[PDB]
């Protein structure tokens, strides 16, 4: 079945580094250079064997035709009001990018306001971030090219959608916040650097600053408002309070949910914004999260996890700011995570909880924190919402495994609230009633109970005969909640698959303690939880090891790669997208220094000893047992992935092919695909998304010999 030869890849046997006394060889270190002829030649050599492997089977074209048919459904965001006008995003089904529309009212005709599809021939220029002026009359928007995290911020006057001269460069991980006087906007930029800044470089990003751009001026005139030259990893994002009076500055360092909170009372600036602001350092440590909700005069409401791993709402009065004086507006729940909170219609709060990995949505009184209204949802996720302090209505969008969006609307000026379906879409093609979603909790190695969702056709026999696609992430306090994926439903319907999503530790499903039980010294908990989910699916007869595929992206690509190394007997197929594979060196490149809050950093001997045991690059090993080989493996990455630089996947595949691929017992393929004009995933055009899932499922179908079910 393997009609190709792995390319010959030079090993630099002199690349030896001492970590705390332990010598580590890195013979493919030269792949760290994205611009060398050698690296480009390796990528071309790998794509040359991967592409014909994936395309050779007719199943890919059947999958792509079906994905193109079933993904072609209208997709909408919530409506949102800005000034006198409503806006929403909309895709007729297959456009590369969704289009921003504007209307003068809800019953009014809609016009195209911003169509990113016209900015490139191939849909690889995407909107990334935007901010309307407080009165809704002006509009700032970030554009990214080829999926790079780099952004150019541009500006428009809303009435007539008139392009303005203002352009801001060197923007990345940036806030966008206009002052309420309409004069100009806060944003973040990084200093000049040598070499490229287009997403193909690996250069570390440090010394991010906060600037204020005055509309109608050149970027060279912008005001430096905050900088941390003795703390190069600090990132300070600005936002205005709802009354326009205070700039709040959230300073982060790494990815934990914590921040400093400094404020500037703009009434106390003698001369407007002319230099470094008069910051009051309200919270001047990284012990807790303080996420601004609203304020009334000097009484600020924040969502926090300060001594509340499931999060709660507190009121901090700037004129009586000592911690013993804070008021607890909505106390922490014993188990449910308060995920986010919005203030709407002056004195309402909308609170979204996660209860056993499903959202609930509640309305509360701002003054007392009392529950006023439950917004009833089916089982799934709230994935979009609109409703700010000045608005008198909300919209929110619900999704699940089996249903594409429902958008709800509620007019909050009414004495008796009636939330109503505002928009619902139906995918013709899949009968949702043919499938079920179950949630179960399975004991991990240490006995901890882990949630997992399983989606399958009703009536199946649990005789172990079904291919399965098990997904995990496990990290960064990210919760993996139900979402509609027509790509995965094609696997169910047309490949007879079972889908599974394991809510392993490292995620935020059960708050900061869930997150803590899968980071740093406990990172191996994520892997053990994920391997246990696989053994549960096998033991319960959903699938068998040879029919089981696992998949994860980024930190989830680290998850599945490490699982391939640790339990190659457990999986038939592994797809790792944009994975972090070199755990010893991740912190050196672009923004990777920020991940040491989850992983640790190999500069410390203690952290090094955790990382070396699971780092995918350093744990490739031929299974000892004569009858065990590695699963079939496919790594997917792209040449502008400046979030997780692609050298991770390049070095990993070189190593798989050399150590495992060369052996006689290995007959499962070990392949990489590197895409062009794309990056970590955000803003990827629909045409590339379709190509990507087509590759994944053709790899699966070919590797497991799965028949298409028309």
């Amino acid at each position: 079945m393997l009609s190709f030869q792995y390319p010959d890849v030079y090993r630099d046997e002199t690349a030896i580094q001492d970590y705390h006394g332990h010598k580590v060889c890195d013979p493919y270190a030269w792949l760290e250079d994205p611009d060398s002829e050698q690296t480009k030649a390796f990528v071309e050599a790998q794509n040359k064997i991967t592409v014909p492997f994936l395309e050779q089977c007719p199943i890919r074209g059947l999958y792509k035709e079906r994905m193109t048919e079933l993904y072609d459904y209208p997709k909408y965001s919530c409506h949102f009001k800005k000034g006198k006008r409503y806006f929403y995003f909309y895709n007729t089904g297959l456009q590369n990018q969704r289009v921003l529309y504007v209307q003068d009212s809800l019953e009014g005709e809609a016009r195209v306001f911003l169509d990113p599809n016209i900015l490139s021939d191939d849909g690889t220029v995407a909107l990334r971030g935007y901010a309307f002026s407080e009165d809704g009359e002006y509009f700032a928007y970030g554009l990214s090219a080829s999926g790079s995290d780099w952004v150019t911020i541009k500006f428009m006057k809303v009435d007539g959608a008139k392009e303005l001269p203002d352009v801001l460069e060197r923007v990345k991980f940036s806030c966008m916040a206009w002052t309420h006087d309409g004069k100009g906007m806060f944003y973040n930029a990084y200093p000049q650097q040598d070499g490229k800044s287009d997403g193909t470089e690996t250069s570390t990003n440090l010394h991010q600053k906060l600037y204020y751009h005055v509309l109608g001026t050149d970027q060279s005139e912008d005001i430096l408002c905050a900088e941390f030259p003795d703390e190069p990893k600090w990132m300070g994002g600005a936002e205005l309070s709802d009354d326009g009076r205070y700039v709040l500055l959230s300073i982060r360092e790494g990815c934990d949910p914590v921040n400093r909170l400094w404020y500037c009372d703009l009434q106390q600036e003698s001369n407007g914004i002319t230099g470094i602001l008069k910051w009051v350092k309200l919270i001047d440590n990284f012990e807790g999260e303080y996420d601004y909700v609203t304020n009334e005069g000097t009484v600020f409401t924040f969502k926090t996890n300060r001594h509340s791993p499931n999060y709660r709402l507190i009121n901090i009065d700037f004129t009586d700011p000592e911690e013993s004086k804070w008021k607890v507006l909505v106390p922490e729940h014993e188990k449910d995570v308060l995920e986010w909170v919005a203030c709407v219609r002056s004195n309402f709060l909308v609170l979204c909880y996660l209860h056993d990995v499903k959202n609930t949505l509640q309305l509360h009184d701002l003054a007392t924190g009392a529950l006023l209204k439950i917004f009833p949802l089916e089982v799934g996720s709230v994935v979009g919402y609109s409703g700010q302090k000045k608005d008198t209505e909300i919209f929110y969008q619900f999704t699940s495994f089996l249903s594409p969006g429902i958008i709800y609307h509620c007019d909050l000026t009414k004495e008796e609230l009636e939330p109503r379906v505002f928009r619902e879409v139906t995918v013709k093609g899949i009968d949702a009633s043919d499938y079920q979603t179950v949630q179960i909790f399975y004991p991990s190695k240490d006995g901890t109970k882990i949630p997992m969702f399983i989606v399958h056709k009703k009536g199946i026999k649990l005789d172990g005969s079904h291919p399965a696609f098990l997904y995990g992430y496990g990290g960064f306090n990210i919760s993996i909640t139900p979402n509609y994926s027509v790509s995965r439903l094609i696997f169910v319907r047309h490949m007879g698959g079972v889908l599974a999503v394991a809510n392993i530790r490292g995620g935020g499903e059960y708050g900061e303690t869930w997150h803590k039980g899968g980071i740093l010294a406990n990172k191996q908990n994520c892997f053990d939880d994920f391997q246990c989910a696989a053994e549960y699916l096998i033991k319960e007869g959903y699938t068998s090891p040879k029919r089981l595929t696992i998949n994860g992206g980024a930190n989830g690509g680290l998850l599945v790669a490490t699982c391939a190394n640790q339990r190659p007997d457990l999986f038939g197929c592994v797809i790792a997208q944009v994975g972090v594979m070199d755990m010893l060196k991740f912190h050196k490149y672009t923004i990777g220094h920020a991940w040491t809050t989850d992983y640790g950093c190999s500069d410390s001997k203690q952290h090094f000893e955790w990382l070396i045991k699971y780092s995918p690059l350093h744990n490739v090993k031929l299974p000892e047992a004569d009858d065990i080989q590695y699963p079939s493996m496919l790594l997917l990455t792209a040449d502008h992935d400046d979030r997780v630089v692609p050298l991770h996947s390049l070095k990993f595949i070189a190593t798989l092919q050399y150590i495992v691929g060369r052996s006689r017992k290995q007959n499962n393929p070990l392949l990489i695909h590197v895409d062009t004009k794309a990056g970590h995933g955000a803003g990827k055009p629909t045409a590339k998304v379709i190509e990507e899932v087509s590759d994944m499922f053709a790899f699966i179908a070919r590797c497991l010999n799965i028949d298409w079910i028309p």
Binding site: C255, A554, N555, V580
Partner: peptide, 4 residues
Amino acid sequence: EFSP
């Protein structure tokens, strides 16, 4: 967001 700048998580992996």
